[PDB]
Amino acid sequence: NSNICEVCNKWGRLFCCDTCPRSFHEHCHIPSVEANKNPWSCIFCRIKTIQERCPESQSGHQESEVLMRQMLPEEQLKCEFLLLKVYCDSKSCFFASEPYYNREGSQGPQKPMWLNKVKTSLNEQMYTRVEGFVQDMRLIFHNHKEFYREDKFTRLGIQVQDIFEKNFRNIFAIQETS
Ligand SMILES: [Zn+2]
Numbered sequence: 001n002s003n004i005c006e007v008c009n010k011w012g013r014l015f016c017c018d019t020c021p022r023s024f025h026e027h028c029h030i031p032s033v034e035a036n037k038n039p040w041s042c043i044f045c046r047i048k049t050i051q052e053r054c055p056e057s058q059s060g061h062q063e064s065e066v067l068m069r070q071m072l073p074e075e076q077l078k079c080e081f082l083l084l085k086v087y088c089d090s091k092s093c094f095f096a097s098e099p100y101y102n103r104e105g106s107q108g109p110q111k112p113m114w115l116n117k118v119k120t121s122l123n124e125q126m127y128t129r130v131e132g133f134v135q136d137m138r139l140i141f142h143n144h145k146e147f148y149r150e151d152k153f154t155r156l157g158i159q160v161q162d163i164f165e166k167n168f169r170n171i172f173a174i175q176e177t178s
């Protein structure tokens with residue numbers, strides 16, 4: 001197994017996966033690492049298995065169809081994974097915790113959002129469809145863009161959104177286009 005967290009790339013108190021070499025801190029894994037379960041499989045492994053069990057799930061889908069899906073166990077897991085994929089980028093630190101807004105010539109967003117809030121929402125099963133999750137994720141980056149305006153810091157929003165969007169298209173096998 002690995003000696004650093006797959007998500008945050010640090011050593012510490014790690015829990016090792018039984019079916020692959022990855023390792024995680026307890027609250028870096030999504031969901032948080034389970035109390036017992038021997039063997040244990042991580043979220044990467046559990047996603048692999050869904051794809052192997054249904055090979056045609058990798059065929060192209062329309063975004064619109066994927067968003068209307070109900071949050072049944074397998075879509076809940078893919079959303080969890082997609083969220084984990086964003087936390088794997090170090091720049092996620094700017095979007096993790098609750099923001100505040102006091103900049104000359106800007107107003108705060110009507111609906112603030114951050115990664116840890118979406119984590120808690122997924123944890124508490126507050127989304128009934130994929131759409132609710134995706135909307136809150138996009139809202140994070142949209143809020144950033146509108147607030148920081150021409151300040152070059154807006155680039156951080158574009159960049160982490162791109163990681164979100166790429167992984168969205170991969171996990172949910174969105175039809176490739178030109
Ligand atoms: Zn970690």
Ligand SMILES: [Zn+2]
Pocket residue numbers: 017018019020021022041042043044045
């Ligand atoms: Zn694994």
Ligand SMILES: [Zn+2]
Pocket residue numbers: 053054
């Ligand atoms: Zn099948």
